[PDB]
Write a protein that binds this ligand. Structure first.
Ligand SMILES: [Ca+2]
Ligand SMILES: [Ca+2]
Lengths: 244, 247
């Protein structure tokens, strides 16, 4: 089921949210356009995005734009199911009641474009929003993990492999800002509504992606595979070309 | 009609897009997104502690401009285009094609948390929050293209925008001062972030940016061939939540 993708009016993400070292066991956010959504192949002309299908699907490859160095970032996505506006405080048990399920997503980033944006203090939008820059899986309904209703913070494990090599493998228990604080903090600035997709950060191990690479990503629940997706990278057509 | 608002999948904006001195007129651009959750319409357009609870079947969201605690807000009056078709990897667009790529235009305010944005700039961090607070995109009803069907060969020079606060005029400029024209904006954007019917594109603001504080009265308008086609007003208030900016 990819239908939830049609109800997504917004995609807000959190950055640098995973511990790289034991000792560290403040936050910034950025948007991603829903036009960047792309779904696995097994789910017009010169077009790199023509809108989602009736069922919310958008099968296609990752379009690496010319001149751009793309880095992959595997992440757990929350599918908000309630209206959250200026929440003063949320407890772990409440995350479950605020979402309809989760999904496995890749927060593709145009590294060199972002490097230049950070240098000039300019918007990150483009480096984070190219078409297909948010490859995502089908939704995993909460009922599938209602048994962990009181706290979902430690049950998930996310991993990403490129060309048969494991590059990222982290558990959500390494998260710096927990799920309940993410939902609460955000609501005090940019109110959330049903259908909103929230990316919660990526674990260490970010690597690059080039045309021809095969990406295999997984989402585990108590070390049990519940999401397995694959994407192929190709050259983005059109006239775009990034040159510093 | 504010129904178009319900169909907007995204809001993209172009920055520093207006000449401030004659000199540049006889001759680079960056973009950023805004959440549709930042939309707010005039009080006469149509729960608890909520500064945004979704749009009505109307497409409206009548309300004040909620200014966050500790935040300094700057107003930016701008012309918004309402895309009507799929634009992806377009190689070239002529001024004449703008009319057929939109269903109309609207008058919008691109509100910004200046001190929050200054900090982001220094730290090289995203502008999202400084540009996305609820109500940070006050916007008018739609102006259907038939209204200006007569200039379908080139709409670049027929509009003018103006913003005034507490009775005093602050911003006033014609779209003829735009550094990057409407057809180029649409074209260039499509080569990175494809557009689909319903997308809203903010096209930049003229010089004269100023501040808005709780209790302020904002009056903005859009003219076509120097005739007022849209006139909207907004009230500023204190954001009612736990948020507070401190440097
Ligand atoms: Ca990320
Ligand atoms: Ca602006």
């Amino acid at each position: 089921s990819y239908n939830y993708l049609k109800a997504a009016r917004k995609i807000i993400c959190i950055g640098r949210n995973y511990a790289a070292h034991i000792k560290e066991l403040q936050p910034f956010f950025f948007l991603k356009p829903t036009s960047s959504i792309v779904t696995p192949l097994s789910s017009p002309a010169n077009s790199t995005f023509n809108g989602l299908n009736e069922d919310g699907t958008n099968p296609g490859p990752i379009f690496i734009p010319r001149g751009v160095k793309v880095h992959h970032e595997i992440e757990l996505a929350l599918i908000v199911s309630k209206h959250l506006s200026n929440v003063t405080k949320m407890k772990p048990e409440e995350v479950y009641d605020s979402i309809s399920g989760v999904a496995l997503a890749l927060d593709l980033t145009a590294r060199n474009v972002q490097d230049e944006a950070k240098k000039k203090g300019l918007p990150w939008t483009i480096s984070k929003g190219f078409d297909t820059f948010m490859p995502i899986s089908a939704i995993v309904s909460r009922e599938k993990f209602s048994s962990y209703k009181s706290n979902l913070q430690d049950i998930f494990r996310v991993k990403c492999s490129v060309n048969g090599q494991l590059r990222q493998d982290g558990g959500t228990n390494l998260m710096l800002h927990p799920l309940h604080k993410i939902l609460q903090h955000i609501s005090t600035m940019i109110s959330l509504e049903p259908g909103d997709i929230i990316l919660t950060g990526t674990p260490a191990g970010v690597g690059e992606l080039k045309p021809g690479d095969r990406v295999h990503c997984e989402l585990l629940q108590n070390n049990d595979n519940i999401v397995d997706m694959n994407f192929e990278c190709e050259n983005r057509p059109g006239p775009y070309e990034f040159r510093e």
